[PDB]
Amino acid sequence: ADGVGSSSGNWHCDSTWLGDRVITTSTRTWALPTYNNHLYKQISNGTSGGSTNDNTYFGYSTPWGYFDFNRFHCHFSPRDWQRLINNNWGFRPKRLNFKLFNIQ
Amino acid sequence: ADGVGSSSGNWHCDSTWLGDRVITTSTRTWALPTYNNHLYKQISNGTSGGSTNDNTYFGYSTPWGYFDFNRFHCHFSPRDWQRLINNNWGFRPKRLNFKLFNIQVKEVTQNEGTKTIANNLTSTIQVFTDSEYQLPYVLGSAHQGCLPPFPADVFMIPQYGYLTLNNGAQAVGRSSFYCLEYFPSQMLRTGNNFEFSYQFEDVPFHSSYAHSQSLDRLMNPLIDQYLYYLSRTQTGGTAGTQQLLFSQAGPNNMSAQAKNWLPGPCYRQQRVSTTLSQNNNSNFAWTGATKYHLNGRDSLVNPGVAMATHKDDEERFFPSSGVLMFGKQGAGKDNVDYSAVMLTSEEEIKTTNPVATEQYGVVADNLQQNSAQPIVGAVNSQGALPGMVWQNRDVYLQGPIWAKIPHTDGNFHPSPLMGGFGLKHPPPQILIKNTPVPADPPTTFSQAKLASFITQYSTGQVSVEIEWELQKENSKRWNPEIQYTSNYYKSTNVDFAVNVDGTYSEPRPIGTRYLTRNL
Amino acid sequence: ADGVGSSSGNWHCDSTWLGDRVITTSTRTWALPTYNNHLYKQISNGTSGGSTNDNTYFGYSTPWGYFDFNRFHCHFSPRDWQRLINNNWGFRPKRLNFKLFNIQ
Amino acid sequence: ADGVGSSSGNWHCDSTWLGDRVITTSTRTWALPTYNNHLYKQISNGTSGGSTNDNTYFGYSTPWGYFDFNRFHCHFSPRDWQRLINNNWGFRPKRLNFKLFNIQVKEVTQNEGTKTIANNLTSTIQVFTDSEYQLPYVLGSAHQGCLPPFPADVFMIPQYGYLTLNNGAQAVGRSSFYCLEYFPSQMLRTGNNFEFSYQFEDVPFHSSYAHSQSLDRLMNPLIDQYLYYLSRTQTGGTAGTQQLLFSQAGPNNMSAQAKNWLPGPCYRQQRVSTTLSQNNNSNFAWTGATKYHLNGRDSLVNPGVAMATHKDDEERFFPSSGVLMFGKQGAGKDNVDYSAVMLTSEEEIKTTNPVATEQYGVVADNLQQNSAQPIVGAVNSQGALPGMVWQNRDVYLQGPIWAKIPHTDGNFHPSPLMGGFGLKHPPPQILIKNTPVPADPPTTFSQAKLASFITQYSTGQVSVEIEWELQKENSKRWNPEIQYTSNYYKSTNVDFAVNVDGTYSEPRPIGTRYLTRNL
Q: Do chains B and D touch (3 or more CB pairs under 8 A)?
A: no
Are C29 and D435 an interchain contact pair (Cβ–Cβ within 8 Å)? yes
Chains touching chain C, criterion 3+ CB pairs below 8 Å: A, D
Which residues does chain A have within 8 Å of residue C22's beta carbon, measured at their own beta carbons? none
CB D305 within 8 A of CB D417: yes
A36-39, Cβ contacts within 8 angstroms, sequence gap of 24 or more:
A36/A61, A36/A62, A36/A63, A37/A63, A38/A63, A39/A63
Question: DSSP per residue over B217-264, as a string?
Answer: G-S-TTS--S--EEEEEE--SSS--EEEEEE---SS--TTS--S-EEP
- Judged by DSSP in three states, A81 sits in helix
**C84 to chain A: closest CA residue:** A87
Q: Return d(Cα B40, Cα B36) in angstroms, integer.
A: 7
Are B184 and A14 an interchain contact pair (Cβ–Cβ within 8 Å)? yes
Residues forming a β-bridge with D458: D32, D105
Which residues does chain B have within 8 Å of residue A7's beta carbon, measured at their own beta carbons? 124, 187-189, 192
Query: Where does residue B510 rank: exposed (0-12), middle (13-18), buried (19+ CB within 10 A)?
Result: buried
Chain C interface residues (partner A, CB cutoff 8 A): 83, 86-87
- Of D274, D284, D361, the closest CA to residue D309 belongs to D274
Task: Please give the distance of CA C17 from its chain centroid, rounded to a whole number.
Answer: 23
Q: Return d(Cα D116, Cα D15) in angstroms, integer.
A: 40
Which residues does chain C have within 8 Å of residue D192's beta carbon, measured at their own beta carbons? 5-7
D37-43, Cβ contacts within 8 angstroms, sequence gap of 24 or more:
D37/D63, D37/D451, D37/D453, D38/D63, D38/D436, D38/D453, D39/D63, D40/D179, D42/D171, D43/D161
Which residues does chain A have within 8 Å of residue C20's beta carbon, measured at their own beta carbons? none
Are C5 and D121 an interchain contact pair (Cβ–Cβ within 8 Å)? yes
Are C13 and D438 an interchain contact pair (Cβ–Cβ within 8 Å)? no
Are B184 and A33 an interchain contact pair (Cβ–Cβ within 8 Å)? no
State the resolution, in angstroms: 2.7
Cα separation values, D252 from B249, D247, D248, D255, D256, Å? 140, 11, 10, 9, 10
- Of A95, A90, A89, the closest CA to residue A75 belongs to A95
Contacts of D424 (CB under 8 A, 6+ apart): D201, D404, D405, D407
Mutate to test the interface with C, among A18, A22, A86 (most CBs of C within 10 A): A86
- Of D465, D504, D496, the closest CA to residue D13 belongs to D465
Q: Do chains D and C touch (3 or more CB pairs under 8 A)?
A: yes
Cα separation values, D40 from D71, D162, D172, D436, Å? 28, 11, 19, 13
CB C45 within 8 A of CB C21: no
Tell me which H or E stretch contains C45.
Answer: strand C41-45
Method used to solve the structure: cryo-EM
Which residues does chain D have within 8 Å of residue C32's beta carbon, measured at their own beta carbons? 441
Indicate the residue of A12, A31, A103 with minimum beta-carbon distance to B450: A31
Q: Return d(Cα A23, Cα A14) in angstroms, integer.
A: 8
Q: Return d(Cα C9, Cα C103) in angstroms, integer.
A: 10
Distance (Å) from the alpha carbon of C4 to chain D's nearest alpha carbon = 6
Q: Which residues of D189-221 are buried (b: 16+ CB within 10 A; e: fewer)?
A: bbbbbbebebebeebeebbbbbbeeebeeebee
Residue type, D482: I
Which residues of D belong to the annotated binding site?
A: 55
Q: Return d(Cα D289, Cα D272) in angstroms, integer.
A: 11
- Judged by DSSP in three states, C55 sits in helix
CB D466 within 8 A of CB D72: no
Radius of gyration of chain B (CA): 28
Q: Return d(Cα C77, Cα D180) in angstroms, integer.
A: 13
Tell me which H or E stretch contains A86.
Answer: helix A78-87
Contacts of D54 (CB under 8 A, 6+ apart): D297, D298, D299
Mutate to test the interface with C, among D103, D106, D182, D445 (most CBs of C within 10 A): D182
Chain A interface residues (partner B, CB cutoff 8 A): 1, 3-7, 9-14, 27, 29, 31-35, 77, 102-104
Which residues does chain B have within 8 Å of residue A33's beta carbon, measured at their own beta carbons? 440-444
- Judged by DSSP in three states, D39 sits in coil
- Of B130, B126, B117, B101, the closest CA to residue B6 belongs to B101
